[PDB]
């Protein structure tokens, strides 16, 4: 019955386990799944990620900050981006960015190595599509990848409104150990696989509500095997049936209350509205961002 | 006192055989929707696509200044219905077309002002 749905999360009884790593071989590899005339991979591929995120407990106040990491394709526009726009509701502000230049339907765009990117402003809502191609290039064991992993998970702990959410884009061989400890930092998690990309080892590994502590600590070398485990002894059909009903996709404009807090005034309260998805905290200032760029004259 | 006429440009390498903008970004979407050409939503009808507008635009996608004196884009940030009879080329559709100042409608794919 899983093929009407947007995708298939890992379930809790795999995240339980302790396995150990092993590589990913899965049945349908290299299948590609039957796309609506017209309809890019990448629109497929965010429309269910989007479908999926509909039924969970995601904030979505007035004014929403949403921000959409490695949104560039070789295609020099940016379908996902497209989408999340659709997805989310009129007027919420979408800043995007991508190491190579692209055109792009987000209110702004930085071009630049993810790490030259700043804002003084924290977010509701953090997507991260990057993947680093050199990443196919596997020449040992298959350890925590640093990289814009690093960037990432310093951007979560500094920059997400409490309440706020996010989506990352892992495989088999581009993830990172710290990302699923920082899971555990989320009023719930999981690892989401959209029905049109089954044939591969990517997932979203998607933090719902964030807490800015650890609810649970979350080896990350176990979990990245037990989600291994649970892809390569789960085969999952390629399905594109979701694509085809729009009617409810529309984030839902929940209007949720946003507050300036203290960390003295986050109690078990307030951490229940958290982790419910009827609260964001941080500042509701103007939203600036910018990149870093280097000088140089090289004549001489 | 030179600038350069990049929509004649478009439209001189259509007329020539050149196979239109590729890419450009098609929404999944009900296709029951108003119809309007430029929206901050996909709106399309039954006889239409709906398009990411950055996508469809001309100017953005050739990295080159639009006309508006300002350089406001009326595509980017929104989404443009497409006759789904001319979604092959979404940049030359809304390069050649105008949109009904006041139903909102394409002017000669909709719009029924006149009658
Ligand atoms: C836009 O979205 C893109 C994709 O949709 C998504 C990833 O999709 P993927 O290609 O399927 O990835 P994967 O093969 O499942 O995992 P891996 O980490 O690349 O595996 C490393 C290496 O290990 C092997 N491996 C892995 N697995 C799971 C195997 C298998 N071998 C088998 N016989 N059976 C299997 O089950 C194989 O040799 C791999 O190469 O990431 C995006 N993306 C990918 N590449 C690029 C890119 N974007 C930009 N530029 C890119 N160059
Ligand atoms: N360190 C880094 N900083 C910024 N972008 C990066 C990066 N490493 C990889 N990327 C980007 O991750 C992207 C993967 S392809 C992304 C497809 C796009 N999100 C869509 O929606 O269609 C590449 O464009 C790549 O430039
Ligand atoms: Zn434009
Ligand atoms: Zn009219």
């Known amino acids: ?300 | 006192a030179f600038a350069v006429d990049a929509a004649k440009a478009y439209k001189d390498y259509l007329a020539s055989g050149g196979q239109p903008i590729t890419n450009c970004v098609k929404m999944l979407c009900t296709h029951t929707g108003t119809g309007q050409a430029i929206t901050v939503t996909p709106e399309a009808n039954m006889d239409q696509e709906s398009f990411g507008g950055a996508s469809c635009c001309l100017y953005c996608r050739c990295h080159i200044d639009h006309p508006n004196p300002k350089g406001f884009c009326d595509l980017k940030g929104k989404y443009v219905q497409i006759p789904t009879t001319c979604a092959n080329d979404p940049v030359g559709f809304t390069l050649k077309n105008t949109v009904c100042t006041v139903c909102g409608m394409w002017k000669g794919y909709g719009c029924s002002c006149d009658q």
């Open chain 1, 1 to 300: 019955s899983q093929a009407w749905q947007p995708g298939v999360a890992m379930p809790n009884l795999y995240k339980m386990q302790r396995m150990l790593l092993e590589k990913c071989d899965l049945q349908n590899y290299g299948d590609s799944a039957t796309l609506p005339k017209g309809i890019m991979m990448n629109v497929a591929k965010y429309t269910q990620l989007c479908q999926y995120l509909n039924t969970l407990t995601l904030a979505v106040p007035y004014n929403m900050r949403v921000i959409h990491f490695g949104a560039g394709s070789d295609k020099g526009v940016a379908p996902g981006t497209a989408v999340l726009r659709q997805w989310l509701p009129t007027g919420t502000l979408l800043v995007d960015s991508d190491l190579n230049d692209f055109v792009s339907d987000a209110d702004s765009t930085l071009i630049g190595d993810c790490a030259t990117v700043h804002t003084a402003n924290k977010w509701d809502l953090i997507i991260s599509d990057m993947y680093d191609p050199k990443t196919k290039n596997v020449t040992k064991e298959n350890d925590s990848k640093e990289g814009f992993f690093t960037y990432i998970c310093g951007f979560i702990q500094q920059k997400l409104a409490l309440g706020g959410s996010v989506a990352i884009k892992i495989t088999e061989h581009s993830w990172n150990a710290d990302l699923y400890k920082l899971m555990g930092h989320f009023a719930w998690w999981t690892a989401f696989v959209t029905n049109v990309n089954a044939s591969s080892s990517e997932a979203f590994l998607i933090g719902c509500n964030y807490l800015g502590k650890p609810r649970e600590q979350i080896d990350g070398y176990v979990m990245h095997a037990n989600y291994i485990f649970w892809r390569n002894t789960n085969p999952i059909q390629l399905s594109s049936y979701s694509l085809f009903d729009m009617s409810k996709f529309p984030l839902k404009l929940r209007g949720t209350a946003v507050m300036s807090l203290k960390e003295g005034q986050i109690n078990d309260m307030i951490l229940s509205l958290l982790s419910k998805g009827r609260l964001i905290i941080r500042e509701n200032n103007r939203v600036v961002i910018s990149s870093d760029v280097l000088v140089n004259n090289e004549n001489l």
